[PDB]
């Protein structure tokens, strides 16, 4: 069955990115929408929107490609997963690509990046890495 | 995979089975 | 202990002059022995080891002391190369020689070991003595009129005194402003090779 919706979202993104698709659709949830917001604000995707599906709602994500058809996402990894979950204190927040990437962290103040969490002095669950 | 490994294993197995056959009554009487 | 045998042997083997004014090295710049002309194989380890031997035979420091210096330099929060070079340059005998009071580093060490100097008003006879900021090195009065210091104080036209030192008195006082930086050290060889060798 489906165990990790977040990992499934990340793999849909990765598979669409590798195939140079301009569009990826998935079932909607608040967590997926929030990490989509973080991705868009960090400039990793072009834009996203939510339609309505036959049963629930869908998530529509536009992938960003450069003028020479070069992908704007180099990698997407799921860090904390069902089973072995990962939590980081405000001081040992992970660095992605030596700071060139973004680590999404679920803190009690919402979804933040590693730099935002470090600035606000909070910890939480390390959802994923983007670079 | 090469059949050489199967040949080594089969020769070991064949020799062991021959040994078991040769001492069936002796094993039965000692056990 | 101390290295006592011939000096030009090391200069010929290492391919550079370490004393500075040695005519034997200029006459034959190739390694000593029967096979001093045989072509050598090229290897990174050989070059690193030769650099380390250059460093530790210029200053007359044995291997264990040199390794202690390297560990100290790596521990410090600078960078390893210039830290090691400055640790080496701060030795009392090197300071004495670099101040022009000794023609060669060997005689600087010999003078220091014989208690001819006096640092900060207390007699010090330890060549490995490290010198800090604002130290006054003086020659004790009994040895001021000796032949070595006589000829040292009337030929002050040799190698220039570096910036971080200053011979200030007619009695050849030595004043240390600050520990030398890499720019003012003016030493042969390459520290990076030594750092590579000791990281193996």
């Amino acid at each position: 069955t489906m165990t990790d919706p977040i990992a499934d979202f990340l793999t849909r993104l990765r598979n669409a990115n590798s195939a140079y698709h301009d569009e990826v659709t998935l079932p909607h949830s608040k967590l997926k929408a929030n990490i989509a917001e973080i991705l868009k604000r960090e400039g990793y995707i072009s834009d996203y929107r939510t339609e309505d599906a036959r049963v629930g709602k869908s998530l529509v994500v536009q992938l960003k490609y450069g003028p020479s058809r070069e992908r704007s996402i180099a990698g997407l990894r799921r860090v904390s997963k069902p089973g072995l979950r990962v939590y980081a204190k405000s001081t040992n927040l992970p660095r992605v690509l030596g700071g060139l990437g973004v680590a999404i962290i679920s803190t009690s103040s919402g979804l933040l990046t590693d730099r935002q969490a470090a600035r606000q002095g909070v910890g939480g669950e390390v959802l994923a890495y983007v670079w | 995979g090469s059949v050489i490994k199967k040949r080594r294993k089969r020769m070991s197995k064949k020799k062991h089975r021959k040994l078991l056959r040769r001492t069936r009554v002796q094993r039965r009487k000692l056990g | 202990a101390r290295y006592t045998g011939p000096a030009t042997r090391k200069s010929r083997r290492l391919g550079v002059d370490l004393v500075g004014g040695d005519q034997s090295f200029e006459k034959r710049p190739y390694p000593p022995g029967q096979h001093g002309r045989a072509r050598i194989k090229e290897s990174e380890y050989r070059q690193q080891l030769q650099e380390k031997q250059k460093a530790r035979f210029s200053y007359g420091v044995m291997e264990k002391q040199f390794r202690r210096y390297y560990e100290e330099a790596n521990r410090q929060p600078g960078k390893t190369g210039d830290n090691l070079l400055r640790i080496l340059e701060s030795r009392l005998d090197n300071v004495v020689y670099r101040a022009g009071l000794a023609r060669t580093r060997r005689m600087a060490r010999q003078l220091v070991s014989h208690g001819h100097f006096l640092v900060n008003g207390v007699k010090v006879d330890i060549p490995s003595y490290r010198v800090s900021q604002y130290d006054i090195i003086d020659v004790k009065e009994k040895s001021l009129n000796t032949l070595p210091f006589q000829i040292a104080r009337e030929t002050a036209g040799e190698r220039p005194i570096p910036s971080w030192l200053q011979v200030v008195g007619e009695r050849q006082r030595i004043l240390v402003h600050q520990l030398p930086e890499r720019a003012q050290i003016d030493v042969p060889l390459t520290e990076q090779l030594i750092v590579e060798l000791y990281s193996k």
Partner: protein
């Protein structure tokens, strides 16, 4: 001025009715020590000739390493064939820390301070290929900011910006 590194010479042979015919293959690294490197693999019946073909092939294929001052931009891991080489930037004055093939490639490329480890397939040709694949994975921060359409400060940590400032000042 170009520096060269003959990292390996191998005597290969093919069998014929008469017997064995031996040739030589040389893997050569060519770079300028300023950020560009090239890898060549030449084969000939004589060692100097094979070295010459390797040198010309390496010069033909050139590739620029995204250095930042004296080290690479960020940690990378490159894999080619079964060879795995990991690269990690180091603070100035550390020196090159790598095995023979990786050390040759990095010294040719002009990298001065880097932590490099080989994690599989000790074969020199494949280790060199993996090192090149890792070096080809590096991204300059300006290109990263361009990809995400953000200012250079919002993408990179302040330490990288300070390092770039010092390097360009020097």
């Amino acid at each position: 001025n170009y520096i060269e590194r003959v990292v390996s010479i191998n005597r290969v042979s093919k069998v014929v009715k008469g017997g064995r015919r031996f040739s030589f293959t040389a893997l050569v690294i060519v770079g300028d020590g300023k950020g560009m490197v090239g890898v060549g693999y030449g084969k000939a019946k004589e060692v100097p000739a094979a070295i010459a073909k390797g040198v010309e092939e390496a010069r033909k294929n050139f590739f620029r390493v995204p250095l930042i001052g004296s080290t690479i931009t960020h940690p990378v891991q490159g894999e080619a064939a079964a060879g795995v080489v990991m690269l990690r930037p180091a603070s100035p004055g550390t020196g090159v820390i790598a095995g023979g093939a990786a050390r040759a490639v990095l010294e040719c490329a002009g990298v001065h301070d880097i932590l490099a480890k080989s994690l599989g397939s000790d074969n020199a040709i494949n280790v060199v290929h993996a090192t090149v694949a890792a070096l080809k994975l590096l991204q300059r921060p300006e290109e990263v900011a361009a990809r995400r359409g953000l200012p250079i400060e919002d993408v990179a940590p302040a330490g990288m910006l300070k390092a770039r400032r010092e390097s360009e000042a020097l």
